[PDB]
Paper text:
These filaments grow from αβ-tubulin heterodimers, which are modulated by a wide range of small molecules known as microtubule-targeting agents (MTAs). Of particular interest is the colchicine binding domain (CBD), named after colchicine, an alkaloid extracted from Colchicum autumnale, which has been used as medicine throughout history and has allowed the isolation and characterization of tubulin. This domain sits mainly in β-tubulin, surrounded by the central hinge helices H7–H8, the strands of both tubulin β-sheets (N-terminal and intermediate domains) and, capped by two loops, the catalytic T7 loop of β-tubulin and the T5 loop of the α-tubulin subunit below.
We soaked tubulin crystals with a concentrated solution of the compound and determined the T2R-TTL-PM534 complex structure to a 2.45 Å resolution. Additional derived compounds have been shown to retain the interaction with these centers while making further contacts with α-tubulin T5 loop (αS178) and top of helix H7 (αR221).22 Our structure highlights that PM534 also interacts with the 3 zones of the CBD, making contacts with β-tubulin N-terminal domain (β-strands S5 and S6), helix H7, the intermediate domain (helixes H8 and β-strands S8 and S10,) and α-tubulin T5 loop. PM534 cyclopropyl is deeply buried in the colchicine domain and forms mainly hydrophobic contacts with several residues of β-tubulin, including βN167 and βF169 (S5), βT239, and βL242 (H7) and βL252 (H8). The pyran ring establishes further interactions with βV238 (H7) and, the propyl chain with βI318 (S8) and βT376 (S10). Remarkably, despite a full occupancy of the compound at the site, the T5 loop was very floppy (especially in chain B), which may indicate a high fluctuation in the hydrogen bond established through this region. Otherwise, PM534 also hydrogen bond βY202 (S6) through the ether moiety and βN258 (H8), which further stabilizes the interaction of the compound with β-tubulin N-terminal domain.
Author numbering:
A (entry chain C): 1 to 440
B (entry chain E): 83 to 139
C (entry chain D): 2 to 42, 45 to 55, 58 to 220, 222 to 246, 250 to 275, 286 to 360, 369 to 441
The structure:
């Protein structure tokens, strides 16, 4: 009951899906062959971890996941990887030719050749669910598959599954490790098309995850493996309430009620702490107050922006590990007197708290230190619109000269789709301004 | 409750329709662009056959 | 992800031959086709250029209207590794006449060439596209080369087409009608190729004479071209982006797809980067500081601090911001390959879509109008069935190409 189906699209979505499912297996004591000795109910069960894992008669715990990419090289590594026995071959779908960082190719030319197959495979997983709750879609904004095919899939899922919840984990482009100059085009196009089909989207700025690995883990030039193992911790903290039980456990859907005041204002800012190397965690245990204070340090945000220059509409704290309410309430009291937490005048100023008692896990051989407690803050702040403004400005620079637009027109798109998408982003930027103004 | 049913079915309906128009306009535009390309390459062949015919004259 | 290679004309076949010698060595391939390398990285991307009795045969096609140049390929080094059926040659020759290559002596043979293309392409799991080596100053490489591109685009309209085009220079002039063959072939490349890398002989000659201090043979000029072509294809041939993804990010406007190559050294990362961006290391006779970069792609080879490469490429951009258009953010892409070239501990190759390339088209247009103003040597063309309008059309199209490069050189963000 209350099953969740994860969909991983394009390189970024797939490689992040690898990190997440490896981490889930470690958190639940699931072996690379899918065996879970601690699970005494063979063939099924309604345990909390069954929201993400189905069970076979042979005792294999199979992720409720689908990996999709328009070229095979990234998903081949999953087929021959450490967790090859974890996934049924039909959950790994591949084409032959990628989208070439072209939204049009991912949404139309190439994507329309595999979309029916992808939906058929998603349908098979949903038929195994006694009470499907919703989908989790992992993708990049910049890739042609991450942007184009994801938009097509989200549109098709709305048709085949009504208003069943769909959550996004979206990789916001960082020029540094980016290989696409047309990344702004693909970002605006996919955001516009998915906006009405997504209920909640967690953006992850690669540049923010990049700086956290350079500053906090002392990695000179982080790799995707470095970024994805940190991103998986955030995803784990967000999904932990669905995979684990607990008295003080607060379901993600309950946070979502507070995080989304209007359908289009569904982009929460995520902040995570602690991110510490082993060398620094040695003989230094970070308390509840320390990791909580770190949530309000902008250097720990998943998206580059300044909440201190914006207004809050919601503040959620997702703790996991050795944490009790007494300490949390004490730490929040301190922060309420030392920080500039300005709320809009039409929303209460309370902080919503959840505590999962299962401690955090780390991938063996990784750079992240194993800590006893951690926290993820989900806040709805107007400051996240800064990420839209930076991306919309780059869009405008290139589109004024119609740079690269012929690649999109050649695949069948029209200039009207560009202007239409850019106007939608303009309205979204205006929407975030309107919610911040005081009432009359 | 029937109003909630109606709005969900209308959201499904509009999505299916708007997507159908998108995938048709794109199919028509791409086929036209690719038809013009092959048509220009046909005029090069027509011009080439007229070059070889102007030589033997 | 296979690529189909094509060599056409005297220049095209000698440049292509050198190219296969260089990459064959890098992948541990001997002149007979066997693999005797020490690294598995040499074979991970081997299928991009080679087909598999536990042998590796270049996916190449040699074309020429005379057997002279191609016969020297079979006897030369690595001459037997090629597939004998992929040799397609005539006899009458082209006589350094574009009309003969594009209409007469070339159109008769073009069909048999396409047959070899179809056979090679049907053996591809997923064909990326094609690359052509040829010159624009001759007759076969220019005339028949442009023809073959138009004919391949008919059967493979959705495949990427690249060309390594050698531009004519009076400093190495083999003929006087070269300004005609170049302006006529440029008229074609503007319409039927996705990326064209302008290998200017004037630049190769000035690099051999001034820098290398060779008071220069075609073998010296080609030693530069083989190093340039090896660096360009590095990202394709070693693990660590397909032809379409590359073209999508390097070509902001369809007609402006002519690039300036660069190589260094002709040693630290700062020194290597500064030399690579110097006008003296450009394989095209154009000064980039007389225009602006629309896009740039650079590849570093060798064991070198990647963190240092990132900082040095951000440094050059910041200190030379005026030579990069502001309306294309993040238009410089860089890669690093752990495997160095041969004989170098670390090198760097770069390709730029710069508005300064108009200087190259201004030089070819001046040599063209100087002859077309008096109708010199026009009988070699009208005698094959051409008219004067076709010459003026090619002139007007290449003049418009210069105007467009200037339009975007002057464009501003505000
Ligand atoms: N965090 C993170 N970002 C990634 C990863 N892989 C790619 N990206 C980002 O994704 C963007 C490029 O899109 P990709 O996902 O690589 O491309 P794609 O979705 O497979 O689509 P196409 O390759 O064009 O068909 C860039 O901004 C990259 O920085 C990854 O493993 N982790
Ligand atoms: C000096 C580097 C040149 C190389 N480019 C690269 O190695 C990197 C760094 C990898 S990523 C990338 C881009 C465009 N990202 O967005 N540039 C390259 C190769 C290429 O093959 C052409 C075929 C005929 C032989 C096409 C191209 O256009 O750039
Ligand atoms: N770099 C270089 N350029 C060449 C070579 N051979 C010919 N060229 C140039 O190509 C032009 C002549 O074209 P060519 O290919 O020889 O005529 P074709 O036999 O009809 O294809 C002249 O401008 C030469 O400078 C060569 O080996 N190397
Ligand atoms: Ca069970
Ligand atoms: Mg991809
Ligand atoms: Mg010659």
């Amino acid at each position: 009951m209350r099953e969740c189906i994860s969909i991983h699209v394009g390189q970024a979505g797939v490689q992040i899906g690898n990190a997440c499912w490896e981490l889930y297996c470690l958190e639940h004591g699931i072996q690379p062959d899918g065996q879970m000795p601690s699970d005494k109910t063979i063939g099924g069960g309604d345990d909390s971890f069954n929201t993400f894992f189905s069970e076979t008669g042979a005792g294999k715990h199979v992720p409720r996941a689908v990996f999709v990419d328009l070229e095979p090289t990234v998903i081949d590594e999953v087929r021959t990887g450490t967790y090859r026995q974890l996934f049924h071959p039909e959950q790994l779908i591949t084409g032959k030719e990628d989208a070439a960082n072209n939204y049009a190719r991912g949404h139309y030319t190439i994507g329309k050749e595999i979309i029916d197959l992808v939906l058929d495979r998603i349908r098979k997983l949903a038929d195994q669910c006694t009470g499907l709750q919703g989908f989790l879609v992992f993708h990049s904004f910049g890739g042609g598959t991450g942007s184009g095919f994801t938009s097509l899939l989200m549109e098709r899922l709305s048709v085949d599954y009504g208003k069943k919840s769909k959550l996004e984990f979206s990789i916001y482009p960082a020029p540094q490790v980016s290989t696409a100059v047309v990344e702004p085009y693909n970002s605006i196009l996919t955001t516009h098309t998915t906006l009405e089909h997504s209920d909640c989207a967690f953006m992850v700025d690669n540049e923010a995850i990049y700086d956290i690995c350079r500053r906090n883990l002392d990695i000179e030039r982080p790799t995707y493996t470095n970024l994805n193992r940190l991103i998986s911790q955030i995803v784990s903290s967000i999904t932990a309430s669905l995979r684990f039980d607990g008295a003080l456990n607060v379901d993600l859907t309950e946070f979502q009620t507070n995080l989304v005041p209007y359908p289009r204002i569904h982009f929460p800012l995520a902040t995570y702490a602690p991110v510490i190397s082993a060398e620094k965690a040695y003989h230094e245990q970070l308390s509840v107050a320390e990791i909580t204070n770190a949530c309000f340090e902008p250097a720990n945000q998943m998206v580059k922006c300044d909440p201190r220059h914006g207004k809050y509409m919601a503040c959620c704290l997702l703790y996991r590990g050795d944490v009790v309410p007494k300490d949390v309430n004490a730490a929040i009291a301190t922060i309420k007197t030392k920080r500039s937490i300005q709320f809009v005048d039409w929303c209460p100023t309370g902080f919503k708290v959840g505590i999962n008692y299962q401690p955090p896990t780390v991938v063996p051989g990784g750079d992240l230190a194993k800590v006893q407690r951690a926290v993820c803050m989900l806040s709805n702040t107007t400051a996240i619109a800064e990420a839209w403004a930076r991306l919309d400005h780059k869009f405008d620079l290139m589109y004024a000269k119609r740079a690269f637009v012929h690649w999109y027109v050649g695949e069948g798109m029209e200039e009207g789709e560009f202007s239409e998408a850019r106007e939608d982003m303009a309205a979204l930027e205006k929407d975030y301004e309107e919610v911040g103004v005081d009432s009359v | 409750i029937q109003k909630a049913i109606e709005e969900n079915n209308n959201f499904i309906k509009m999505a299916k329709e708007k997507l159908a128009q998108k995938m048709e306009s794109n199919k028509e535009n791409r086929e036209a662009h690719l038809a013009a390309m092959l048509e220009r390459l046909q005029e090069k062949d027509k011009h080439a056959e007229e070059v070889r015919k102007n030589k033997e004259l | 992800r296979e690529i189909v290679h094509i060599q056409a004309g005297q220049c095209g076949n000698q440049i292509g031959a050198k190219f296969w010698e260089v990459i064959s060595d890098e992948h541990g391939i001997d002149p007979t086709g066997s693999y005797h390398g020490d690294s598995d990285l040499q074979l991970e991307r081997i299928n991009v250029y080679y087909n598999e009795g536990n042998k590796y045969v270049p996916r190449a096609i040699l074309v020429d209207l005379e057997p002279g140049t191609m016969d020297s390929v079979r006897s030369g080094p690595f001459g037997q590794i090629f597939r004998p059926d992929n040799f397609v040659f005539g006899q009458s020759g082209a006589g350094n006449n574009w009309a003969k290559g594009h209409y007469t002596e070339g159109a008769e043979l073009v069909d048999s060439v396409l047959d070899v293309v179809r056979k090679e392409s049907e053996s591809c799991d997923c064909l990326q596209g094609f690359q052509l080596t040829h010159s624009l100053g001759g007759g076969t490489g220019s005339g028949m080369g442009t023809l073959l591109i138009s004919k391949i685009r008919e059967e493979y309209p959705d495949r990427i087409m690249n060309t390594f085009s050698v531009m004519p220079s009076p400093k190495v002039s083999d003929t006087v009608v070269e300004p005609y063959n170049a302006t006529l072939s440029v008229h074609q490349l503007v319409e039927n190729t996705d990326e064209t890398y302008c290998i200017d002989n004037e630049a190769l000659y000035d690099i051999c004479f001034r820098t290398l201090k060779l008071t220069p043979t075609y073998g010296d000029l080609n030693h530069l071209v083989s190093a340039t072509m090896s660096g360009v294809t590095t990202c394709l041939r070693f693990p660590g982006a397909d032809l379409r993804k590359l073209a999508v990010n390097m070509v902001p406007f369809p007609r402006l797809h002519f690039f300036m190559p660069g190589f260094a050294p002709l040693l630290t990362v700062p020194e290597l980067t500064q030399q690579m961006f110097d006008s003296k290391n450009m394989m095209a006779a154009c000064d980039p500081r007389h225009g602006r970069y629309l896009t740039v792609a650079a590849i570093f080879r060798g064991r070198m601090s990647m963190k240092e490469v990132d900082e040095q490429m951000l440094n050059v951009q910041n200190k030379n911001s005026s030579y990069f258009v502001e309306w294309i953010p993040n238009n410089v892409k860089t890669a690093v390959c752990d495997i160095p070239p041969r004989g170098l501990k670390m090198s760097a190759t770069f390709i730029g879509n710069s508005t300064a390339i108009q200087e190259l088209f201004k030089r070819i247009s001046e040599q063209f109008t100087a002859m077309f103003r008096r109708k010199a040597f026009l009988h070699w063309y009208t005698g094959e069935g051409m008219d004067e309008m076709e010459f003026t059309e090619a002139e007007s199209n290449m003049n418009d190409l210069v105007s467009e490069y200037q339009q975007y050189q002057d464009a501003t963000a505000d």
